[PDB]
Design a binder for this molecule. Structure first.
Ligand SMILES: [Zn+2]
Lengths: 468, 86
RNA sequence: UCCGCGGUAGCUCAGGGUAGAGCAGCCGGCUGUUAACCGGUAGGUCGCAGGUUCGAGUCCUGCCCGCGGAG
């Protein structure tokens, strides 16, 4: 629907200003109940919507996760520490969309600092799943997903560190791409695990993902970890193998809910009638990756969130002392954050560094290896984004029980491998997602292979309650 | 294998002051989590990859205007960031 | 320096209500033992100095010593 809008705009049938007014209204009427947006781009939207040339993304408006810097707009990262913070600079990704006519609708709700899998850890309020108001939209990009599924926005930006983009996309029945680590800039991302973080696109159609990526991705002189690889995404004008080899991961086959297994089998039939060589492969140490993640990520998180004392920009907790202020200000963290940064400090702490961090590092290198070997025999890998559909609020608030949500998605980050969650059917009224991932740098492969599926099937995309 | 003393030590290193209620709570969580993680198998690691990093040229880039910088500060005084004394 | 296990007969180690067992020692028995064994018996700064308890080897505060482990 995104590319459809830009079409109507370029032909003079509609003006960008019209599109904004339309979406702004819908938000003001639906968001109250949904709770998808934290902040909204004030008068600076209507004003900005009436000065645009018919640029590639002119008529388009984007919903950005609130841990991504937007100059002049409140970027809280879903935390109390930053509930009044307003960046004097703009995230490279966001900056690029803006230069192509795009505009920010508002800022999306997330789990505090991106650490969460249900949005139930937002310092402000939870977000509701448009398909079922009694169930979570996933996390931590729960807001962005929820916004898309309710057509509160044509495009959306999220953040992925352990599946924070895929898991929500699955729960809300939309597309979520985690870019190969280095494709999209991290400059402007209030990130928590530097080695694993990546800004990811999400949309209601694969052609739309192409729009975002083509605009957002690319080398940034400010990010020393960015790759010099031209996007070239919108060349999804398919000359697609036929005949790619697809490998299904055994380890992720057992433990899935009826609707996931069902959606999985059906997808295979589809890829076969498409000309793919489907074969079962082995991801030996994949099941043990969840552990390595919750020792590598928390480690980097402790050091990344260390900067948040009340000195230069956060909230001040008003201690009236020297260290007592820093100590009191950081107490404003949420239960989940505290938990993680305490773990992170332990894993790096003296006497435990090699015993844990050093251990998890060596294991992280195994996965990359086992993956290199797998892509010597297959061209794509398939598994569920999650073993089940969205769960109901309150259901899974146990430290470990929450961590296992990211069981299938953690691997993509530890390896850097691009991965895409796509609506692969339902089980009842709740959407179900499948995760399709490729070797490094071949992000466009994933996209075209999903265009094939999105087409071979009419559409497994339901718009819970959507309209222009 | 996690004593209340370590928690204190950790919360010290992380400069995070939690309530005695949270301490008892987090004490149970951390235990379970550190057990889950400890299940991680040990593995051999190979050569530390090839170095392909890049360097930035020594060319000046415009700075923030003092006004915009201090606007983030909870407390400022005569062009300085103001914090409680040491 | 920190951390984790240790310190009990001589030697090597068992364990909130006489502190115990086999090795050797002592007494008694046995003509083929290979680390002989059978009975009886003797053997103590439970690490040291302070607490809780009616009662502490056992629990809890500090220190000495040994081994091991950390970028
Ligand atoms: Zn500078």
């Amino acid at each position: 629907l995104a590319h459809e809008i830009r079409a109507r705009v370029a032909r003079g049938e509609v003006s960008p200003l019209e599109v904004a007014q339309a979406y702004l209204k819908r938000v003001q009427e639906l968001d109250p109940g949904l709770g998808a947006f934290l902040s909204l781009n004030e008068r600076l939207l209507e004003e900005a919507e009436a000065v645009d040339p018919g640029l590639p993304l002119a008529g388009l408006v984007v919903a950005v996760k609130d841990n991504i810097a937007t100059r002049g707009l409140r970027t809280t990262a879903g935390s109390r520490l930053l509930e009044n913070f307003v960046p004097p600079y703009e995230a490279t990704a966001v900056a690029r969309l803006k230069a192509l006519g795009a505009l920010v609708l508002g800022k999306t709700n997330l789990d505090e600092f991106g650490m969460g899998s249900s949005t139930e850890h937002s310092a402000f309020f939870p977000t509701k799943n448009p398909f079922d108001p009694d169930r979570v939209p996933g996390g931590s990009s729960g807001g962005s997903a929820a916004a898309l599924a309710a057509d509160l926005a044509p495009l959306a930006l999220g953040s992925d560190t352990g599946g924070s983009v895929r898991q929500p996309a699955a729960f809300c029945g939309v597309y979520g791409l985690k870019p190969t680590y280095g494709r999209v800039s991290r400059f402007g991302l209030i990130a928590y695990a530097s080695s694993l973080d990546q800004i990811g696109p999400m949309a209601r159609s694969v052609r739309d993902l192409a729009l975002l990526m083509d605009a957002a991705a690319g080398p940034d002189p400010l990010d020393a970890t960015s790759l010099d690889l031209p996007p070239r995404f919108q060349e999804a004008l398919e000359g697609p193998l036929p005949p790619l080899r697809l490998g299904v991961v055994r380890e992720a086959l057992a433990g899935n809910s009826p609707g996931v297994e069902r959606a999985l089998e059906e997808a295979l039939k589809v890829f076969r009638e498409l000309g793919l060589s489907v074969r079962e492969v082995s991801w030996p140490s994949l099941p043990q990756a969840l552990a390595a993640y919750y020792i590598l990520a928390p480690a980097e998180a402790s050091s990344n969130l260390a900067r948040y004392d009340g000195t230069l920009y956060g909230r001040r907790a008003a201690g009236e002392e020297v260290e007592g202020m820093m100590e009191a200000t950081r107490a404003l963290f949420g239960l989940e954050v505290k938990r993680r940064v305490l773990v992170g400090t332990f894993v790096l702490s003296s006497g435990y560094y090699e015993a844990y961090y050093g251990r998890a590092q060596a294991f992280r290198r195994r996965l990359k290896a086992e993956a290199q070997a797998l892509f010597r025999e297959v061209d794509l890998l398939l598994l569920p984004t999650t073993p089940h559909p969205a769960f109901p609020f309150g259901a899974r608030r146990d430290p470990l029980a929450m961590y296992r949500e990211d069981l299938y998605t953690v691997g993509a980050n530890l390896t850097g491998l691009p991965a895409l969650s796509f609506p692969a059917g339902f089980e009842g009224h709740l959407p179900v997602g499948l995760q399709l991932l490729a070797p490094w740098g071949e992000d466009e492969r994933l996209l075209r292979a999903a265009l094939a599926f999105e087409e071979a099937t009419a559409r497994a995309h339901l718009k819970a309650p959507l309209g222009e | 294998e996690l004593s209340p003393e370590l928690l204190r030590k950790l919360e010290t290193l992380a400069k995070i002051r939690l309530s005695p209620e949270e301490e008892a709570l987090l004490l149970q969580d951390l235990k379970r989590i550190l057990d889950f993680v400890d299940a991680l198998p040990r593995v051999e690691e190979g050569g530390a990859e090839e170095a392909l990093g890049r360097l930035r040229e020594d060319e000046p880039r415009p700075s923030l205007p003092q006004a915009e910088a201090l606007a983030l500060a909870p407390e400022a005084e005569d062009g300085f960031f103001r914090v409680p004394p040491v």
